[PDB]
Amino acid sequence: AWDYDNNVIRGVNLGGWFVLEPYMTPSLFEPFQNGNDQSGVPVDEYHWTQTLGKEAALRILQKHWSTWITEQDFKQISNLGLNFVRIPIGYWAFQLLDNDPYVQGQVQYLEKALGWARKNNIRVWIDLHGAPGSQNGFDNSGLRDSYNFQNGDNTQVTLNVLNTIFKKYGGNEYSDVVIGIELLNEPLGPVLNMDKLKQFFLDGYNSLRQTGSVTPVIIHDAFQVFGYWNNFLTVAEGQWNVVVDHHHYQVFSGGELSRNINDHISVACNWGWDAKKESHWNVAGSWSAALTDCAKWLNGVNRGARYEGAYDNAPYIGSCQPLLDISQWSDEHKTDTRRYIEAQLDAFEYTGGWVFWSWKTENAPEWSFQTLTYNGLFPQPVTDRQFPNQCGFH
Ligand SMILES: O=[N+]([O-])c1ccc(O[C@@H]2O[C@H](CO)[C@@H](O)[C@H](O)[C@H]2O)cc1
Ligand SMILES: OC[C@H]1O[C@H](F)[C@H](O)[C@@H](O)[C@@H]1O
């Protein structure tokens, strides 16, 4: 269903759909606020569902699931010359731990989406975005500020969920649609046991193949250096159809945020040069147009932006408020954004392709393929170049 040797992925994530992210759907979190005090807002889907309780959470999520992405989005994704979607889903869609506050029902909509993908000749990765106990302590794992994925029975539960995913989506029924199953989104390498993570990846790989599935196995790079995974899951060991998913941003530290636009572009180009040297098929499965961390709650509920010196003892670089609405952007920022998007596109198409994060947000333009396209900052068609050949790939 996909030729990873001869095809380039041009895709978007369907983020914020099956795993709530405050910065992507702030309207679901804002009502908990008391005036300007944010201390009472649930920081993640875990706490959101827990505070709401099952009945309300299910009501509110059913409205969200049935409206946030529909078949019209898939048609538009297709119309825009995109050929791919990555679909994040949390473990809780498939299995609840004892005492999990999460509500279920995502599977219904995942399967609707696979059909919509099929109707529109769009291919899919199914991405396990959140693991029990959390693999990274990010709010987008479902559970912020803890990472107990490798503690207790959390790894085993994760593998059990993957086996469920493998059986339902790794087999013949979806062989024309699903061109990858991603074992685990963004395990936070630096705080995990990497030997245990490798064993987990290998267990996932073996289990999938053991079902008779030939679906590509997608492993996130765990924030390791380029080439780190070169010697893992290799053809030499009879391990095949493996893709490395690299994520790329330049906004999550003061140092990165301080780069001028030329330096930002140089970094993006070098992502390409480095990816090219790797020995697995690889795709930039998340990246965006963001040159700031200004989107409300991007760093989490009740956390400010490093860009304006309002988070993690970071110092002021610039004001975020003028950057919140794309209609108020300076000509310089619009130009910087288009250059940055084009440089990243070139870099990522230099290997397996790219998957923008994300298709849509309520009101965070840096993070919305739709919004950037509508404002002429994301090339349309995606091959368009206002700033051709910023990288000089050979
Ligand atoms: O050194 N590393 O391994 C590392 C450093 C910074 C990282 O940045 C994280 O990226 C996530 C995804 O965009 C954000 O949700 C999160 O807020 C941010 O802290 C993630 C990983
Ligand atoms: O932080 C922006 C974006 O970064 C990564 F792509 C995460 O996997 C997403 O969940 C998140 O929304």
List the helices and strands and how they pair.
Layout: E1 9-13, H1 45-52, H2 54-68, H3 71-79, E2 84-90, H4 106-119, E3 123-130, H5 154-169, E4 178-182, H6 194-210, E5 217-220, E6 242-247, H7 254-257, H8 261-277, E7 281-286, H9 331-349, E8 353-356, H10 369-374
Parallel strand pairs: 1-2, 1-8, 2-3, 3-4, 4-5, 5-6, 6-7
Helix pairs in contact: 1-2, 5-6, 8-9
User: What would you say the CATH architecture is?
Assistant: Alpha-Beta Barrel
Bound molecules: 4-nitrophenyl beta-D-glucopyranoside, alpha-D-glucopyranosyl fluoride
State Rg: 20 Å
Q: Roughly what fraction of the amino acids lie in strands?
A: 5-15%
Name of the CATH first level: Alpha Beta
Keywords: Cell adhesion, Cell wall, Cell wall biogenesis/degradation, Cleavage on pair of basic residues, Disulfide bond, Glycosidase, Hydrolase, Secreted, Signal, Transferase, Virulence, Zymogen
Subunit structure: Monomer. Interacts with the human antimicrobial peptide LL-37.
InterPro entries: Glyco_hydro_5, Glyco_hydro_5_CS, Glycoside_hydrolase_SF, Glycosyl_hydrolase_5
Binding site for substrate: 21, 23, 186, 249, 256
How would you describe what is shown here?
The chain has 394 residues and is an alpha/beta fold. The protein is 32% helix and 11% strand. It has ten helices and eight strands. Strands 7-6-5-4-3-2-1-8 form an eight-stranded parallel sheet. Helix 1 (45-52) packs across helix 2, helix 5 runs parallel beside helix 6 (194-210) and helix 8 runs parallel beside helix 9. The chain starts with 8 loop residues before the first strand and ends in a 20-residue tail after the last helix. Bound molecules: 4-nitrophenyl beta-D-glucopyranoside and alpha-D-glucopyranosyl fluoride. Residues 138, 140, 188-190, 223, 249, 252, 299 line the site of 4-nitrophenyl beta-D-glucopyranoside. Alpha-D-glucopyranosyl fluoride is lined by residues 15, 21, 140, 185-186, 247, 286, 357. It is found in: Secreted, Cell wall.
